[PDB]
Amino acid sequence: ANPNFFETNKDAIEHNKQIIENICEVLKAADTLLYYDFRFNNISKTDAK
Amino acid sequence: FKNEKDRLFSITSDMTRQYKQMQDELLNQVNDLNKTVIEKDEEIKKKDQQIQDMTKDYEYKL
Amino acid sequence: FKNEKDRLFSITSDMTRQYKQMQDELLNQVNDLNKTVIEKDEEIKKKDQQIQDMTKDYEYKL
Numbered sequence A: 001a002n003p004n005f006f007e008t009n010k011d012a013i014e015h016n017k018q019i020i021e022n023i024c025e026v027l028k029a030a031d032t033l034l035y036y037d038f039r040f041n042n043i044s045k046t047d048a049k
Numbered sequence B, C: 001f002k003n004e005k006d007r008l009f010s011i012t013s014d015m016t017r018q019y020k021q022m023q024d025e026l027l028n029q030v031n032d033l034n035k036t037v038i039e040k041d042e043e044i045k046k047k048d049q050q051i052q053d054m055t056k057d058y059e060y061k062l
Helices: A011-029 B002-025 B028-061 C002-061
Strands: none
Touching: B002 C002, B028 C002
C-alpha cells in the first residue's frame, strides 16, 4: 500500500525497539519488581513475543 | 486514511507524469500531415494559377 | 478525510479527463489533417477537370 513507508519510519520504530530492549534488560536485572500491569494499553505482538 | 493518502498520491503523481511524457511523445503524424497539407495547398494554388492563365490566353486568342 | 477525499478524487478525475481530452485533440488533429488532404485532393481533381474542360471548349472555339 505504501512501499516507502518503511524507509521514512526509522526514528519511531527504532525508538520503540530500544524501549522494548530496555524493558527486557530491566526485567532481567529486576531482582525485586515482580508485579506489572499493561492492561488497556497498545502493546504490539512483536513486543509481546 | 494515511495509507490511502500515500497510495493515491503515488498513483496520481505517476499517472500525471505518464500523461505528460505521452503527450510530449505524440508529435510526428501531426507534423507529417501538416507538411502534406501545406504542399498540397501549394498545388491547389498552382492549379488555380494555371486555370486563370489558360483562361486569359485563350480569351486573348478569341 | 471525506472532504479531502472528495476534493482529491474530483481533481484527479478532472485531470484524467483533461489529459484524455488533450490526447483527443492530438488524435483529431491527425484526423482533421487527413480530412484536409481529402478535401484538397477533391479540389485538385475538380480543378484538373475544369482545366481540361475549359481548354477543350477554348480549342473548339479557336
